CSV table of C-alpha atoms and ligand atoms in Angstrom, one decimal:
chain,number,residue,atom,x,y,z
A,10,UNK,CA,120.1,-150.8,74.8
A,11,UNK,CA,120.6,-149.4,78.4
A,12,UNK,CA,124.3,-151.7,78.8
A,13,UNK,CA,125.1,-152.0,75.0
A,14,UNK,CA,125.4,-148.5,74.9
A,15,UNK,CA,128.7,-147.6,76.9
A,16,UNK,CA,130.9,-145.1,76.5
A,17,UNK,CA,134.4,-145.9,77.9
A,18,UNK,CA,137.6,-144.4,78.9
A,19,UNK,CA,141.5,-145.8,79.4
A,20,UNK,CA,145.0,-144.1,80.5
A,21,UNK,CA,147.3,-145.0,78.1
A,22,UNK,CA,151.1,-144.9,79.1
A,23,UNK,CA,154.0,-143.5,76.0
A,24,UNK,CA,153.6,-147.0,75.0
A,25,UNK,CA,149.7,-147.2,74.6
A,26,UNK,CA,149.7,-149.5,77.0
A,27,UNK,CA,146.8,-149.3,79.3
A,28,UNK,CA,148.0,-148.0,82.6
A,29,UNK,CA,144.3,-147.3,84.8
A,30,UNK,CA,145.1,-148.5,88.5
A,31,UNK,CA,148.5,-146.9,88.2
A,32,UNK,CA,150.6,-145.0,90.4
A,33,UNK,CA,151.7,-141.2,88.4
A,34,UNK,CA,154.4,-138.4,89.6
A,35,UNK,CA,153.3,-135.0,90.2
A,36,UNK,CA,154.6,-134.0,87.1
A,37,UNK,CA,153.4,-136.5,85.2
A,38,UNK,CA,150.9,-135.7,81.3
A,39,UNK,CA,147.5,-138.4,82.2
A,40,UNK,CA,146.0,-138.6,78.6
A,41,UNK,CA,143.5,-140.2,78.3
A,42,UNK,CA,141.5,-142.0,75.5
A,43,UNK,CA,137.6,-141.5,75.3
A,44,UNK,CA,134.8,-143.5,73.8
A,45,UNK,CA,132.0,-142.4,72.6
A,46,UNK,CA,130.1,-145.2,71.6
A,47,UNK,CA,127.4,-144.7,68.8
A,48,UNK,CA,127.4,-148.7,67.7
A,49,UNK,CA,123.6,-149.5,69.1
A,50,UNK,CA,122.2,-146.8,66.7
A,51,UNK,CA,123.5,-148.5,63.6
A,52,UNK,CA,121.2,-148.8,60.3
A,53,UNK,CA,117.9,-147.2,63.2
A,54,UNK,CA,115.9,-143.8,62.1
A,55,UNK,CA,115.4,-141.5,65.4
A,56,UNK,CA,112.7,-139.3,65.6
A,57,UNK,CA,112.9,-135.9,64.5
A,58,UNK,CA,112.1,-134.3,67.5
A,59,UNK,CA,114.6,-136.6,69.7
A,60,UNK,CA,117.6,-136.1,67.4
A,61,UNK,CA,117.6,-132.2,68.4
A,62,UNK,CA,118.0,-133.4,71.4
A,63,UNK,CA,121.6,-133.5,70.0
A,64,UNK,CA,124.7,-135.4,71.8
A,65,UNK,CA,126.7,-134.5,74.2
A,66,UNK,CA,130.0,-136.1,75.6
A,67,UNK,CA,131.2,-134.8,78.8
A,68,UNK,CA,134.6,-135.3,80.3
A,69,UNK,CA,133.9,-135.2,83.9
A,70,UNK,CA,137.8,-134.8,85.8
A,71,UNK,CA,138.3,-134.9,89.6
A,72,UNK,CA,138.9,-131.1,89.8
A,73,UNK,CA,140.8,-130.7,93.5
A,74,UNK,CA,143.6,-132.9,91.1
A,75,UNK,CA,143.5,-132.5,87.8
A,76,UNK,CA,144.2,-128.9,85.9
A,77,UNK,CA,141.1,-128.5,83.7
A,78,UNK,CA,142.7,-125.6,82.6
A,79,UNK,CA,145.4,-127.5,81.1
A,80,UNK,CA,143.5,-129.7,78.9
A,81,UNK,CA,145.2,-130.5,75.1
A,82,UNK,CA,143.0,-131.6,73.1
A,83,UNK,CA,145.4,-133.6,71.0
A,84,UNK,CA,142.9,-135.1,68.7
A,85,UNK,CA,138.6,-136.1,68.0
A,86,UNK,CA,137.8,-138.3,65.1
A,87,UNK,CA,134.8,-140.4,63.7
A,88,UNK,CA,135.8,-143.9,63.0
A,89,UNK,CA,135.8,-143.1,59.2
A,90,UNK,CA,139.1,-140.9,60.5
A,91,UNK,CA,136.8,-137.6,60.6
A,92,UNK,CA,138.8,-135.0,62.1
A,93,UNK,CA,134.7,-133.9,63.9
A,94,UNK,CA,136.4,-131.1,66.2
A,95,UNK,CA,134.7,-128.3,64.7
A,96,UNK,CA,131.4,-129.5,64.9
A,97,UNK,CA,131.5,-130.1,68.4
A,98,UNK,CA,131.3,-126.9,71.0
A,99,UNK,CA,133.6,-127.3,73.6
A,100,UNK,CA,132.6,-125.8,76.7
A,101,UNK,CA,134.8,-125.6,79.5
A,102,UNK,CA,132.2,-126.1,82.3
A,103,UNK,CA,133.2,-124.9,86.1
A,104,UNK,CA,130.0,-125.2,87.6
A,105,UNK,CA,126.7,-125.8,86.5
A,106,UNK,CA,125.0,-122.5,88.4
A,107,UNK,CA,124.5,-120.2,85.5
A,108,UNK,CA,125.1,-123.2,82.9
A,109,UNK,CA,122.9,-122.6,79.4
A,110,UNK,CA,119.7,-123.1,80.5
A,111,UNK,CA,119.0,-125.5,77.7
A,112,UNK,CA,122.1,-127.7,78.1
A,113,UNK,CA,121.3,-127.7,82.0
A,114,UNK,CA,118.0,-129.1,81.7
A,115,UNK,CA,119.5,-131.7,79.0
A,116,UNK,CA,122.0,-132.9,81.9
A,117,UNK,CA,119.2,-132.7,84.3
A,118,UNK,CA,117.1,-134.6,82.9
A,119,UNK,CA,119.7,-137.7,81.2
A,120,UNK,CA,120.3,-139.4,84.3
A,121,UNK,CA,124.1,-137.6,84.1
A,122,UNK,CA,125.4,-135.9,87.7
A,123,UNK,CA,128.8,-134.2,86.7
A,124,UNK,CA,130.4,-133.6,90.0
A,125,UNK,CA,132.0,-129.8,90.1
A,126,UNK,CA,134.0,-129.0,87.2
A,127,UNK,CA,134.2,-130.6,83.4
A,128,UNK,CA,134.1,-130.5,79.7
A,129,UNK,CA,131.4,-131.2,77.7
A,130,UNK,CA,131.6,-130.6,73.9
A,131,UNK,CA,127.8,-130.7,72.2
A,132,UNK,CA,126.8,-131.6,68.3
A,133,UNK,CA,126.6,-127.9,66.8
A,134,UNK,CA,124.8,-129.6,63.7
A,135,UNK,CA,122.5,-132.7,65.7
A,136,UNK,CA,120.8,-133.3,62.1
A,137,UNK,CA,124.3,-133.1,60.3
A,138,UNK,CA,125.8,-135.3,63.3
A,139,UNK,CA,123.2,-137.8,63.4
A,140,UNK,CA,122.8,-138.3,59.5
A,141,UNK,CA,126.7,-138.7,59.5
A,142,UNK,CA,127.6,-140.4,62.1
A,143,UNK,CA,125.3,-141.3,64.9
A,144,UNK,CA,123.1,-143.5,62.5
A,145,UNK,CA,126.4,-145.1,61.2
A,146,UNK,CA,127.3,-146.7,63.8
A,147,UNK,CA,130.6,-144.8,63.6
A,148,UNK,CA,132.7,-144.0,67.6
A,149,UNK,CA,134.1,-140.9,68.0
A,150,UNK,CA,137.1,-141.0,70.1
A,151,UNK,CA,138.3,-138.2,71.8
A,152,UNK,CA,142.6,-138.8,72.5
A,153,UNK,CA,142.6,-135.8,75.7
A,154,UNK,CA,145.6,-134.9,77.7
A,155,UNK,CA,145.7,-133.1,81.5
A,156,UNK,CA,148.4,-132.4,83.6
A,157,UNK,CA,148.1,-132.1,87.8
A,158,UNK,CA,147.1,-129.1,90.2
A,159,UNK,CA,151.0,-127.8,91.9
A,160,UNK,CA,149.2,-128.1,95.2
A,161,UNK,CA,147.6,-131.7,94.8
A,162,UNK,CA,150.2,-133.6,96.7
A,163,UNK,CA,148.5,-136.9,97.8
A,164,UNK,CA,145.3,-138.7,97.1
A,165,UNK,CA,143.9,-140.8,93.9
A,166,UNK,CA,143.2,-139.1,90.1
A,167,UNK,CA,139.6,-139.5,88.7
A,168,UNK,CA,138.6,-139.3,85.4
A,169,UNK,CA,135.2,-140.6,84.0
A,170,UNK,CA,133.1,-139.8,80.7
A,171,UNK,CA,128.8,-139.9,80.0
A,172,UNK,CA,127.2,-139.6,76.7
A,173,UNK,CA,124.3,-137.6,76.0
A,174,UNK,CA,122.6,-139.4,73.0
A,175,UNK,CA,118.8,-137.6,71.8
A,176,UNK,CA,119.2,-137.3,76.1
A,177,UNK,CA,119.4,-139.9,76.9
A,178,UNK,CA,122.2,-140.1,80.1
A,179,UNK,CA,124.7,-143.1,80.3
A,180,UNK,CA,128.2,-143.9,82.5
A,181,UNK,CA,131.2,-144.3,81.6
A,182,UNK,CA,134.2,-146.5,84.0
A,183,UNK,CA,136.4,-144.8,86.1
A,184,UNK,CA,139.7,-143.7,85.8
A,185,UNK,CA,141.7,-144.3,88.6
A,186,UNK,CA,145.5,-143.9,89.8
A,187,UNK,CA,146.9,-142.6,92.7
A,188,UNK,CA,149.5,-139.9,93.2
A,189,UNK,CA,152.8,-141.1,94.6
A,190,UNK,CA,153.7,-139.1,97.8
A,191,UNK,CA,157.0,-138.4,97.0
A,192,UNK,CA,159.4,-137.5,100.2
A,193,UNK,CA,163.2,-137.6,101.3
A,194,UNK,CA,165.0,-137.7,104.4
A,195,UNK,CA,168.8,-136.1,104.7
A,196,UNK,CA,170.4,-137.0,108.7
A,197,UNK,CA,173.8,-136.3,109.3
A,198,UNK,CA,175.7,-139.1,111.6
A,199,UNK,CA,178.9,-139.2,113.6
A,200,UNK,CA,179.5,-142.8,111.1
A,201,UNK,CA,177.3,-144.9,108.5
A,202,UNK,CA,176.4,-147.5,111.3
A,203,UNK,CA,176.0,-145.1,113.8
A,204,UNK,CA,172.7,-142.9,115.5
A,205,UNK,CA,171.8,-139.5,114.7
A,206,UNK,CA,174.1,-136.4,115.8
A,207,UNK,CA,171.1,-133.6,114.3
A,208,UNK,CA,171.2,-131.0,116.7
A,209,UNK,CA,174.3,-132.4,117.9
A,210,UNK,CA,178.5,-131.2,118.4
A,211,UNK,CA,180.9,-132.0,116.0
A,212,UNK,CA,184.5,-131.2,117.4
A,213,UNK,CA,187.0,-129.6,114.3
A,214,UNK,CA,188.5,-131.8,112.0
A,215,UNK,CA,186.4,-134.2,112.7
A,216,UNK,CA,184.2,-136.7,110.1
A,217,UNK,CA,181.1,-136.7,109.7
A,218,UNK,CA,178.7,-138.2,107.5
A,219,UNK,CA,175.8,-137.4,105.4
A,220,UNK,CA,172.8,-140.2,104.5
A,221,UNK,CA,170.6,-138.9,101.5
A,222,UNK,CA,167.8,-141.2,102.0
A,223,UNK,CA,166.2,-141.6,98.4
A,224,UNK,CA,162.9,-142.3,97.8
A,225,UNK,CA,161.5,-145.5,96.6
A,226,UNK,CA,159.7,-146.3,93.3
A,227,UNK,CA,156.8,-148.5,93.5
A,228,UNK,CA,156.2,-151.0,91.6
A,229,UNK,CA,152.6,-151.0,89.8
A,230,UNK,CA,153.9,-148.1,88.3
A,231,UNK,CA,152.5,-146.4,85.2
A,232,UNK,CA,156.6,-145.2,84.4
A,233,UNK,CA,160.0,-146.4,83.5
A,234,UNK,CA,163.0,-144.1,85.1
A,235,UNK,CA,164.9,-141.0,83.0
A,236,UNK,CA,165.9,-139.5,86.4
A,237,UNK,CA,166.8,-140.0,89.8
A,238,UNK,CA,169.2,-138.0,90.5
A,239,UNK,CA,170.7,-136.5,94.4
A,240,UNK,CA,171.7,-132.9,94.3
A,241,UNK,CA,173.3,-131.1,97.7
A,242,UNK,CA,175.1,-127.2,98.4
A,243,UNK,CA,177.6,-128.6,101.3
A,244,UNK,CA,178.0,-125.8,103.6
A,245,UNK,CA,182.0,-126.1,101.8
A,246,UNK,CA,182.8,-123.3,104.3
A,247,UNK,CA,182.8,-125.5,106.7
A,248,UNK,CA,182.2,-129.4,105.6
A,249,UNK,CA,185.0,-130.6,103.5
A,250,UNK,CA,183.6,-133.2,101.1
A,251,UNK,CA,185.9,-136.1,101.3
A,252,UNK,CA,184.0,-139.6,99.4
A,253,UNK,CA,180.5,-140.6,99.0
A,254,UNK,CA,179.0,-144.2,98.3
A,255,UNK,CA,175.8,-145.1,96.9
A,256,UNK,CA,174.2,-148.2,97.8
A,257,UNK,CA,170.4,-149.7,96.8
A,258,UNK,CA,167.9,-150.1,99.4
A,259,UNK,CA,165.7,-152.3,97.9
A,260,UNK,CA,166.0,-155.3,95.2
A,261,UNK,CA,166.3,-154.1,91.8
A,262,UNK,CA,165.2,-156.7,88.6
A,263,UNK,CA,166.1,-155.7,85.6
A,264,UNK,CA,165.3,-156.1,81.8
A,265,UNK,CA,167.6,-159.3,81.4
A,266,UNK,CA,165.9,-160.6,84.7
A,267,UNK,CA,169.6,-160.2,86.8
A,268,UNK,CA,168.4,-159.3,90.4
A,269,UNK,CA,170.4,-156.8,92.2
A,270,UNK,CA,170.1,-157.1,95.7
A,271,UNK,CA,169.9,-155.0,98.6
A,272,UNK,CA,172.8,-153.3,100.1
A,273,UNK,CA,174.0,-153.8,97.0
A,274,UNK,CA,177.3,-151.1,95.8
A,275,UNK,CA,175.4,-149.3,92.6
A,276,UNK,CA,178.6,-146.6,92.4
A,277,UNK,CA,179.4,-148.2,88.5
A,278,UNK,CA,175.7,-147.2,87.5
A,279,UNK,CA,176.4,-143.7,88.8
A,280,UNK,CA,178.6,-140.1,88.4
A,281,UNK,CA,179.3,-138.5,91.5
A,282,UNK,CA,180.1,-134.5,89.9
A,283,UNK,CA,182.0,-132.7,93.6
A,284,UNK,CA,182.2,-128.9,92.4
A,285,UNK,CA,185.6,-127.8,94.7
A,286,UNK,CA,185.0,-124.5,94.0
A,287,UNK,CA,181.4,-124.2,95.1
A,288,UNK,CA,180.3,-127.2,97.7
A,289,UNK,CA,177.9,-128.3,94.6
A,290,UNK,CA,177.7,-131.9,94.9
A,291,UNK,CA,175.5,-134.5,92.3
A,292,UNK,CA,175.3,-138.2,92.1
A,293,UNK,CA,172.9,-139.3,89.0
A,294,UNK,CA,172.2,-142.9,88.2
A,295,UNK,CA,172.8,-143.4,84.6
A,296,UNK,CA,170.2,-143.2,81.5
A,297,UNK,CA,170.7,-146.5,80.1
A,298,UNK,CA,171.1,-148.2,83.4
A,299,UNK,CA,167.6,-146.9,84.3
A,300,UNK,CA,165.8,-147.6,81.2
A,301,UNK,CA,166.7,-151.5,82.5
A,302,UNK,CA,165.0,-151.3,85.7
A,303,UNK,CA,161.2,-153.0,84.8
A,304,UNK,CA,157.9,-151.8,86.4
A,305,UNK,CA,157.5,-154.7,88.5
A,306,UNK,CA,160.6,-153.7,90.7
A,307,UNK,CA,160.8,-151.3,93.0
A,308,UNK,CA,163.7,-148.4,92.7
A,309,UNK,CA,165.6,-146.8,96.0
A,310,UNK,CA,168.8,-145.9,96.7
A,311,UNK,CA,170.9,-143.8,99.7
A,312,UNK,CA,173.7,-141.7,99.3
A,313,UNK,CA,175.9,-141.5,101.5
A,314,UNK,CA,178.5,-138.3,101.8
A,315,UNK,CA,181.3,-137.9,103.9
A,316,UNK,CA,182.8,-134.5,105.2
A,317,UNK,CA,185.6,-133.7,107.5
A,318,UNK,CA,184.3,-130.0,109.7
A,319,UNK,CA,187.3,-127.5,108.8
A,320,UNK,CA,185.6,-124.9,110.9
A,321,UNK,CA,183.6,-123.6,113.5
A,322,UNK,CA,179.9,-122.4,113.5
A,323,UNK,CA,177.0,-124.0,112.9
A,324,UNK,CA,176.8,-126.1,109.8
A,325,UNK,CA,173.0,-127.0,108.3
A,326,UNK,CA,172.3,-129.6,105.5
A,327,UNK,CA,169.8,-130.6,103.0
A,328,UNK,CA,169.3,-132.1,99.6
A,329,UNK,CA,166.7,-132.5,96.7
A,330,UNK,CA,166.6,-135.7,94.4
A,331,UNK,CA,164.6,-135.7,91.8
A,332,UNK,CA,163.1,-138.5,90.1
A,333,UNK,CA,161.8,-138.0,86.3
A,334,UNK,CA,162.2,-134.5,86.8
A,335,UNK,CA,160.1,-134.3,90.2
A,336,UNK,CA,162.2,-132.1,93.2
A,337,UNK,CA,161.6,-133.7,96.0
A,338,UNK,CA,163.3,-131.3,99.0
A,339,UNK,CA,164.3,-133.2,102.4
A,340,UNK,CA,164.4,-132.0,105.8
A,341,UNK,CA,167.4,-129.9,107.1
A,342,UNK,CA,169.5,-130.9,109.6
A,343,UNK,CA,172.2,-129.0,111.4
A,344,UNK,CA,175.4,-129.5,113.6
A,345,UNK,CA,177.7,-127.0,115.7
A,346,UNK,CA,181.3,-126.9,115.6
B,1,CA,CA1,134.6,-132.9,87.9
């Protein structure tokens, strides 16, 4: 039965599809569906002393990546539909050092080895729980949502469950997701195809071009696109906005099968707003367009913002890209006039 008892977990997108192995974003909600497998136990009779050792389920999240305190338990349900949340002790174990001695001994003797922080669910009434669910072979399904720690900027995210029945430990699969590291860059040029003039001198009355380089959204991701917006507070005391342009930086495939080639003008899929009084510049991709980009396609664009230098002094610029609600701040650039 060692290979016939198999707790499992998966991670699912907003359409209930598995995204195990896929990339996610810093502000992503990770929703896992975990199974506590009792199928093998159906119709059998466990010894009373073995039943007394109870039924424990463990969710071992990577505590460097996942904020364990953000857990929302969406549901914990038996195969017969029963809500079993009130039948289980939910324990957020931050360290085993002084964990309840009985439970700590149970974990030790099980063969199971949770690392760092974990949650455990313990049947409050082993005999009752055994009779109602375990002996009937009724699996328990846990639906759990976590957020990431804001200080976890890159690396992989892992989640693994364990099951301890009658003191016997069993290992679940390791669900892995990659956190994309988001970066964007700003440069300042004499002209669109020219050389960087960062820290250079710009004569009054001349034009300069800022390039706002958008982050490329990678393939094999676990999400679709709902926002991709450039925001730039221009130093409008010194830089007078003239015009912009936005270009695809990768080939983009849409749901209809059509392809937008790298270098194509993307203006018609966007809206530019410039506020002359405040110097606030924004270019946002339209949601109905973003919704058509397939997951097997990369997505990226650069914006080029043309300004006239109207006053002497030091002139700085930076921009922020918002990708699905994640702000990505660029480096700064400066020039002097
Ligand atoms: Ca852990």
